[PDB]
Amino acid sequence: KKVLTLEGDLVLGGLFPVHQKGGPAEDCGPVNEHRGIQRLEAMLFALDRINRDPHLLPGVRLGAHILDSCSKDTHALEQALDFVRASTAITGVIGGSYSDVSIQVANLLRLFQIPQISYASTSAKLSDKSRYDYFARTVPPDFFQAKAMAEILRFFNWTYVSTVASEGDYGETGIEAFELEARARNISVATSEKVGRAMSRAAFEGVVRALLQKPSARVAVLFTRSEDARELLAASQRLNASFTWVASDGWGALEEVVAGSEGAAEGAITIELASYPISDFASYFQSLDPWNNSRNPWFREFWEQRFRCSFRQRDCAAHSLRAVPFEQESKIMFVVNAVYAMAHALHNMHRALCPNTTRLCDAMRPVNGRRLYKDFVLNVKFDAPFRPADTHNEVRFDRFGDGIGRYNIFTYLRGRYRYQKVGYWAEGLTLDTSLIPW
Amino acid sequence: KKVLTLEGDLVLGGLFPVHQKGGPAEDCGPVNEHRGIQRLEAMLFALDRINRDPHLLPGVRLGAHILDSCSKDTHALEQALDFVRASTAITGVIGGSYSDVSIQVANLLRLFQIPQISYASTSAKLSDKSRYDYFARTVPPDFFQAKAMAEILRFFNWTYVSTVASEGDYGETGIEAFELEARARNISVATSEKVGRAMSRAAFEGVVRALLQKPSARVAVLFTRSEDARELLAASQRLNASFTWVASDGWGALEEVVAGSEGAAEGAITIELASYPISDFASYFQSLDPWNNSRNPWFREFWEQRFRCSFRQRDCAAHSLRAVPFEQESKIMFVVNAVYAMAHALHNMHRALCPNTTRLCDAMRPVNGRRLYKDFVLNVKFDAPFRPADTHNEVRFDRFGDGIGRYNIFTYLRAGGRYRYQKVGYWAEGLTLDTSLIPW
Numbered sequence A: 001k002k003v004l005t006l007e008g009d010l011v012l013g014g015l016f017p018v019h020q021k022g023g024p025a026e027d028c029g030p031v032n033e034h035r036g037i038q039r040l041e042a043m044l045f046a047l048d049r050i051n052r053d054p055h056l057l058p059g060v061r062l063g064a065h066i067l068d069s070c071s072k073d074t075h076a077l078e079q080a081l082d083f084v085r086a087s088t089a090i091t092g093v094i095g096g097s098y099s100d101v102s103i104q105v106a107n108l109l110r111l112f113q114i115p116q117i118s119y120a121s122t123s124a125k126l127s128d129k130s131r132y133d134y135f136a137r138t139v140p141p142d143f144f145q146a147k148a149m150a151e152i153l154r155f156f157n158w159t160y161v162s163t164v165a166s167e168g169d170y171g172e173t174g175i176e177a178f179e180l181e182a183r184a185r186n187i188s189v190a191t192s193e194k195v196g197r198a199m200s201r202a203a204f205e206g207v208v209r210a211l212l213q214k215p216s217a218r219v220a221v222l223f224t225r226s227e228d229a230r231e232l233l234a235a236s237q238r239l240n241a242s243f244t245w246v247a248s249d250g251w252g253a254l255e256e257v258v259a260g261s262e263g264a265a266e267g268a269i270t271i272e273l274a275s276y277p278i279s280d281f282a283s284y285f286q287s288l289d290p291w292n293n294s295r296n297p298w299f300r301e302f303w304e305q306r307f308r309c310s311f312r313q314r315d316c317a318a319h320s321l322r323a324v325p326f327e328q329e330s331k332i333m334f335v336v337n338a339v340y341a342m343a344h345a346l347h348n349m350h351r352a353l354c355p356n357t358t359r360l361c362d363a364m365r366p367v368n369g370r371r372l373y374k375d376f377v378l379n380v381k382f383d384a385p386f387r388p389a390d391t392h393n394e395v396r397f398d399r400f401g402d403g404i405g406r407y408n409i410f411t412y413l414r415g416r417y418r419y420q421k422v423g424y425w426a427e428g429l430t431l432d433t434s435l436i437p438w
Numbered sequence B: 001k002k003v004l005t006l007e008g009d010l011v012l013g014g015l016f017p018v019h020q021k022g023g024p025a026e027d028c029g030p031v032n033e034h035r036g037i038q039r040l041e042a043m044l045f046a047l048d049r050i051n052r053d054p055h056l057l058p059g060v061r062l063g064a065h066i067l068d069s070c071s072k073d074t075h076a077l078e079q080a081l082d083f084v085r086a087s088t089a090i091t092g093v094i095g096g097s098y099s100d101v102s103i104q105v106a107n108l109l110r111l112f113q114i115p116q117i118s119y120a121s122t123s124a125k126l127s128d129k130s131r132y133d134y135f136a137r138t139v140p141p142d143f144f145q146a147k148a149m150a151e152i153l154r155f156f157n158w159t160y161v162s163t164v165a166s167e168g169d170y171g172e173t174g175i176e177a178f179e180l181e182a183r184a185r186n187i188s189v190a191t192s193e194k195v196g197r198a199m200s201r202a203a204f205e206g207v208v209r210a211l212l213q214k215p216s217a218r219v220a221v222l223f224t225r226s227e228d229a230r231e232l233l234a235a236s237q238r239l240n241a242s243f244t245w246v247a248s249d250g251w252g253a254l255e256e257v258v259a260g261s262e263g264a265a266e267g268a269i270t271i272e273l274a275s276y277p278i279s280d281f282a283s284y285f286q287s288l289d290p291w292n293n294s295r296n297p298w299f300r301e302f303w304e305q306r307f308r309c310s311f312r313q314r315d316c317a318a319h320s321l322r323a324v325p326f327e328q329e330s331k332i333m334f335v336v337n338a339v340y341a342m343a344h345a346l347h348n349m350h351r352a353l354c355p356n357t358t359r360l361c362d363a364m365r366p367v368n369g370r371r372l373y374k375d376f377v378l379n380v381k382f383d384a385p386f387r388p389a390d391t392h393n394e395v396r397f398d399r400f401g402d403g404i405g406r407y408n409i410f411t412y413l414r415a416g417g418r419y420r421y422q423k424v425g426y427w428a429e430g431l432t433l434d435t436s437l438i439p440w
Ligand SMILES: N[C@@]1(C(=O)O)CC2(CC2)[C@H]2[C@H](C(=O)O)[C@H]21
Pocket: A035, A097, A098, A099, A100, A120, A121, A122, A123, A170, A224, A225, A226, A249, A250, A251, A331
């Protein structure tokens, strides 16, 4: 219903879960604030810096055609029909965020040779190039995440664990990979529970007692969506049930997962893909205003939900995102590098196909998608923009078009509670014991 | 590359694995005779009789747009694009065969509200109408088949078994459903192996070796693709490894799965969905020759493969199917049943939308798929066409567009060479098997 359009010489398709998935009947629920709106603004911020970059396509302005997935694969696939209908013209696609939506969207995109780079889809399956030949990502596959989690249990001598998976490609294949890896380290799994898309608080108590039916297994491994980890922790709190949580990037270092069930979560070890905040995105997001951000068609709806106001009611104007603490979303960097990977690919494309000018020559009217994905997108290699220069971070894709298997490890501890970085994984597990009380 | 097109007032899409899958450079392999050609020819047969029928769509003609899936989802989806290029116009789609083919095709077909009826896709994944709101099938979900297979093990007190599943939505869900039914009947799994999309003869051996790592687990439960079962039977014969096979409809009673691996498979228990060879299909298929069947662009290739001749070298001419021992592929009836399910739904929709004529009126141009599926496809009830005398079977779909969980159980034995399938029993809301018919 709402289209996000930016004019430009070339148009970059975008796909973001602006809204949450709806209730039993509605396809779209409330605005997904952090992983939705903020990740969308990250693509818009990147496109602005690129359009100001004199070293990166100074003669070709990049546009955007950003669609909302509503956190549901079938809705994203109904929306992704815009990207194919013409064949405005869509050069590539940034997104989606959730694996299921990327799989579904990739199967349609390959039929029209549309390149796609995801900034958050981690499911290992997307690494298979015979089925997903137009798919690249700035994120590593979950082969490497599940391997890393198996080493955490191997290190802390945890050999009788349990597993919790969100239904879908991410949770199932993620736990499946974890099965192989725990097996390979003498770790035996007591039981394996699966969480339905939209369970009730009664259903999660079912899962708690299901995990409890083996009291000896006090450790639980999770390949879960954040809502699921939060409802399961809430259910654990209500049922006065104490588990040792070992969780994937779904939970990550999200305050919203543990908020209200901080006691039930204390002791937990979580994983986030290795990222850093970008300060120029921070000041850009906090200076965003509903009367100046008309280019984002969902920014007013976010503003009404963020501040409990209405533009009809005239009570939105006194608020600012600067009064608020800015908790920059974890995968913001990966959105930023994914837009840059596509822009560099196209800069390299233009350099070779239009040597005589900075403008778009007939050799890129239209842009050959196959040549773009195979010869340029896959062969990008540049410094991550805005990177913490003290550490050398580089943007490229391996033989399977995946990002680098590097993860940060955290712990939820204690009045007051907080996630603390305790280690990392980058080919090997590396963590210091001095940062854990147990 | 080829597309079987025929004129009609309404056009029904078709999807069959006319060709097996190829290698890395090719997307299409040799001709698939049984699950390809006979299945394609069954739809043409049904179309031909529907168009002669004075009681079923007398004034409305049915055309077709039959595509080749090449036993591969990505190729099928490239092809299925034809069905949605109107936005010739496609009213409904008959197909595909492979469950991963039918899933991919449905995700697209629902976008343009096009009803889909599969004659072979058994994945339980396809029973969920939130996700597959325009899909229906003349076959049951694998929820019942997995229940059927654990009942067979529980009956023979095989408490320690191994599993093998073809990667994808048929193998993985089938076996997972099976393993839960096995657990609940105290049947423990020793090991579980996966058969990938691009398997090598060495990789197939690695699967056999993994199965032998548990020497007590002599039972091997498979939810595999046809080709995946044959190659596992080939790898086991190469290794003189002996397993009791219990296998899903993928294997079924296919002679092509056991060819060259007759001793490796002896004593195998195989499942097929309960069906009957249909009456007039044998006359039709056997009366097919290459100088009349120009309407099937893959038929000449089937002819060459069948008789090991060449039209370019003119050896083929002196041949006819009316001398061969006609083996009617087990799902022929479900293909014919799907074609007739769509025909009846449209006949009934036409009664509702065009009451003053036999011809396709404007209230039905184009056919509204949402109304066709929900108000007419899901509600169809009719006597199964071409049903043999002693049979009184009815074609219908349940609340979730599913067929009924009915299956025949067979066993593979050496009688007089001369190896064959023998029906030992059936499954229909409980197990019934004749222990007297199994040699072992
Ligand atoms: N890595 C994810 C995926 O779907 O592939 C798992 C997740 C569901 C929890 C979403 C995370 C995110 O948006 O930060 C993606």
